Ligand SMILES: Nc1ncnc2c1ncn2[C@@H]1O[C@H](CSCC[C@H](N)C(=O)O)[C@@H](O)[C@H]1O
Ligand SMILES: [Zn+2]
Ligand SMILES: [Zn+2]
C-alpha cells in the first residue's frame with residue numbers, strides 16, 4: 001500500500 | 009524548495025537533490041496536501057479538513073458522519089465533502105468505498121476547481137506522476153478496475169470522471185506516489201497526495217523523514233546532506249530483512265533498492281537472529297520457519313479485520329512459542345508478533361499485558377532501526393503513556409523524554425506534538 005513507517 | 013531541485017537520477021527516474029547543505033533537524037521544505045482524506049475509523053476524533061485532533065467537533069447536520077473544528081472548516085471542506093455528504097445518507101451502511109477510491113475522488117474534484125499548478129506541485133505535478141502502467145500485471149489491473157467501478161458506484165452523482173484509461177493511470181499514480189498520514193504513535197490517520205514530497209526516491213538508510221502538521225507534510229534531515237546529494241525518504245517499515253523489504257518494494261513500487269543497507273545486508277544477521285542451541289536448526293529448517301513467519305504475518309494482517317481480540321492474542325502467542333524454539337526475542341519476526349500482541353492488549357484495555365510486551369520490544373527496536381526513527385520514538389511514547397497511566401512516573405517521564413528527543417529532530421523542536429507530550433510530563 002501507500003508510503004508509511006509502519007502498517008504491519 | 010529554493011535550495012532544492014528535481015533532476016534525473018540514473019536508474020531511478022526523477023528525484024530531489026540538495027543545492028545547499030542540511031544539518032540533522034533542518035526543515036528541507038513543507039508541502040501542502042493536494043488531496044487528503046481522513047480514515048473511516050478516525051471519524052469523530054479528527055477534523056476532516058485540517059486533521060486537528062480535538063474534542064467537541066461539529067457533526068455535518070445532513071450526514072451526521074463528518075466532523076469539523078467549526079463552520080469554517082465545514083465550509084472550506086464542503087467542495088471535497090460534497091462528493092460524500094449525500095451518498096452517506098442515501099447508501100446508509102453500504103457506503104463502503106476503499107480509502108484509495110475516496111482519495112482518488114478528491115483528486116478529480118480538485119482538478120475541476122483548481123486546474124492550474126497548485127502550491128503542492130512546485131516541482132512535480134499530479135499529471136506528471138509515475139504510474140508504471142507498462143509494468144502492471146493482471147491482478148493489479150484487476151484491483152484498479154474494481155476501484156474504478158466503486159468510484160462510479162458511489163460518486164457518479166457528484167464528480168466529473170474522465171475515460172476509463174485515464175483513471176487506470178491515475179489510480180496507478182496514486183499507488184506509486186501516495187502517502188499515509190500517521191500520528192505520533194504511528195497510527196493510521198488517513199491518506200494524502202503530496203506531489204512535491206513524492207519526487208523523493210527511496211532508501212533503507214534515508215537522509216530525510218516525512219512528518220505531518222495536520223494535512224501539511226514536513227521534510228526534515230536525519231543525516232547530514234551536502235550540496236549535489238540526492239534526498240531519500242523511506243517508503244516502507246525498515247525493521248525487516250533485505251529480502252522482505254525488497255519483496256514489498258518490487259511489489260508496490262517496481263524496483264529493487266540498492267542502498268548500503270541492501271548491499272551489505274549488515275543488519276540481517278541480527279534481524280533474523282537464531283538461538284545458540286546444541287541442536288541448532290538447519291539452513292532448511294531456518295528457511296522453513298522464516299517462510300512460516302511471513303505467512304503468519306500476512307494472515308494476522310487479514311485476520312485483524314474480523315477476528316475477536318482474544319483470538320488475535322491467541323495466534324500471537326501461538327506464533328511466538330513456536331518460533332521461540334529457534335528465534336531469539338530480538339528476532340524481527342518475534343518482534344512483529346510482540347508488537348501486534350501489544351496492540352490487542354491495548355484494545356482489550358489490558359494495560360499491564362501491553363506494557364509487558366513494550367518492554368521486550370524497545371531495545372531490539374533501537375538496534376534494528378536507524379537513528380532518529382519515529383518507529384522507536386512512538387514505542388517509547390507508547391511505553392511512556394502506559395507507565396503514566398499506571399502511576400509509574402519515573403519510568404514514564406524517562407520514556408517520554410526518549411520520545412521527545414527523537415521527535416525534536418524529526419518533527420521540529422516546536423511541533424504541536426512535543427508540547428502535547430511535555431504537558432504529560
Ligand atoms: N531506491 C530506488 N531505486 C530505484 N528506483 C526508485 C528508488 N526509489 C524510488 N524509485 C522510483 O521512483 C518511484 C516512486 S515515485 C518517486 C519519483 C520517481 N523517481 C519519478 O520519476 O516520478 C518508484 O516506482 C521507482 O520507479
Ligand atoms: Zn478543522
Ligand atoms: Zn455531510
Ligand SMILES: [Zn+2]
Nearest residue numbers: 212265267270
Ligand atoms: Zn535499501
